Amino acid sequence: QREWFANPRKDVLAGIVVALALIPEAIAFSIIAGVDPQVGLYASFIIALITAFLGGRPGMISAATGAMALLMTGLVKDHGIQYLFAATVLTGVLQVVFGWAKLARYLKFVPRSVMVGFVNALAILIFMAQLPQFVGANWQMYAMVAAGLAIIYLLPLVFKAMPSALVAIVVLTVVAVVTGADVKTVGDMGTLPTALPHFQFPQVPLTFETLAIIFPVALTLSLVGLLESLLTAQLIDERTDTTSDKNVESRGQGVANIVTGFFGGMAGCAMIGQSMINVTSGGRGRLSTFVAGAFLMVLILALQPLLVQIPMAALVAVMMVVAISTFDWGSLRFPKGETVVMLATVAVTVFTHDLSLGVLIGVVLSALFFARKV
Template sequence: MQFSLAYFTQYKVNVKDEVLAGLTTALALVPEVVAFALLAHISPLVGIGSAFIICLVTSVVGGRPGMISGAAGSVAVVIVSLVVQQGVEYLFLAVALMGIIQVAIGLLRLGKFIRLVPQPVVYGFVNGLAAIIFMAQLEQFKTHDAAGAEHWLTGSALLIMSGLVALTMAIVYFLPRLTKAVPSSLVAIAVVSALVIGGGLQTKAVGDIASIAGGLPTFHLPQVPLSWHTLAVVLPYAFIMALVGLTESLLTLTVVDEMTDTRGRGNQDCVAQGLANIASGLTGGMGGCAMIGQTMVNLESRGRGRLSGVVAAGALALFVVAGSGLIERLPLAALVGVMFMVVIGTFEWASLRILRRMPASDVFVMLLVTLVTAISQNLALAVLLGVVVSALSFAWENAKRIRARHHLDAAGVKHYELYGPLFFGSVQAFGEKFDVANDPAEVILDFRESRVADMSALDALHKLTERYHRAGKTLRLRHLSPDCRHLLGRAGALVEVNVLEDPLYTVSGANVAY
């Protein structure tokens, strides 16, 4: 792989657009990363340093150009208890192990399993993340009094904050209708910042959250005892962080694919996320993954290639080393306004338009994933629940499709022609379709339009065979596929398989690259 300007702009994007999109994205990253670091009880500089490392590595070698990764809130939620109970050094080791796990998942090409996530789950995931981003911005409408108690803004402070947010959103919305020469988000931040700084308006700024002045991350081995006890402490966190990070990253990749009508590489991105987290852990950083909010900022600013991510990472480094004084003066209202527009763009409004046309089970799954994502902020749990409920719903619907048609041939043999899959969900209905007591001495069960899917189906066939055997009758199976015959091999002489007529089943799409 050769890293040249052509590599970073391989999607034939405009270099100017990439640079401006990267700068805009970096500005949107700062308050989010600082907030997530504080949530995880670590220094804001650790969060920004982690965002720099993760954004840079994934932009260079990631599987989805245009996607922005950084120190994400979904991972920050997981590590809170580890930091509080064990300290940040254990966190650094957990992050490095998280990266190793993600690299292994990518090398084993397990990223392809993201294809098993149903569309209602994707809708719920995206809508839940939009809710999380929205709720995170509401924190900027709060302040602390002299005693440290938290209160909502009131009076002129609230009016100024709300007015500046509204102005930012208006610029982001209307400017593209006049010109697309520069990203509207960047213009909005510049205009509102000039208005606040030049006009001396008193409103919350980035520096009110925390100072971002400092240096770049350096190599740092976690200072923890090398023992099995240490591994037992950090490994569970590493696994959870790895799964949460890859879940958000791969689903964000899917969303970006749909928005840009291009295709990313899931397994390559798994490896890239892993390498980024290894680098973050070994430079004293927190874990991260793809950030859908900042990715939307980048895409809406016309960032499509790798260069925009590299510029965003470089800008973060520049902010810390030389530009902290200016960045800390930026009004939070401008960044909140940009993120509110991201919420509007991220939310799948189409899911509401088709709500009445969706099956009730899909509506339930979408709402379940949205609520679990928004309330718990545990993306892996939300997606897992959505997939499980979708699978159970699918199994239930298919279980109702099992049916059998029967007739007697000229020789007095009764034929049962089975339709629909025979699996754990349909075995009970399957067993009720046979009249063992009144059937003739020989019965043939035809699987031309069915197949044996699992161990429950195999067990049901054995039990049915035994019922006929106890009645002094013979049950023969016909038109079984090769994989079904393999499952039924131990049924012995009671099973007749017509090899010449058995269809050969193959799985289409086996060569899909991931």
């Protein structure tokens, strides 16, 4: 059976840390995808749980990332936050289908140009998503986001193994509350969780015509999620040692997303950064991810009235730096076609504000170049 409970002392702690790092991610990504923070937090929780029990690679955090959100942001403003639920259920179904058929090894065939393009487009789309918080501008917004970047970039050279983003959020919250600053707070953008996720059958989609409109986004969500899970897995593999079956990982991902969709949640996948922060801080057990999700839920339920008071400048700063962390690649001075693919995805996503379209043209372009090679 090979199932363990080794190193609880470090796993629990690591889970706590990455949970504290997980809250603002889910809230923000929820706002970016035009939906309530509740959906993102729920998603992170239940996904972390189910992956903790059925995941392939232990110590890998699967919660809620922009890589999923920016693919649903178009589905929510055209059909609603609930066609999203259907799409997440179907996504999980496609993932357990992908795992049952044992097709993970084919993920290598996916062009690097398409992937790097996806990453770039993703990041700059994050940065662009932070812009509608500046169109209605009070100088408190500017001052607190600038001081946010400042404290995030200048404090950690003096401090230790505790996030500068944590200090940023806490300090800016305390300030905004005490000084009574006039700025938008998170509680305005959407409702925050006040109870446990209840079984919400997607009462909002209807069979076939729904299928015809959620199948593409479920496909892209599934593929992106399995890619993310694959690379995150392999990086944890390199960091330590494992013979992790990526098929089992894909299945766990699938089931997770399925029940997530059945409990009023978003779509989720593996998170590189938080998995790395986890393994670096001593997390290498399933209890790490479990405690991540659980302590996430407990803490967001605990700080709820304080949570809704958190100023939007702090979170827009955190997103502002997560974008920067995501984008920067090797801007090479190389195959013209591949560069063409990356820049195509980037430019198309930038112009249309649709990540799915960038992915689509990436796929078809890579296919054309392939036909030209073959």
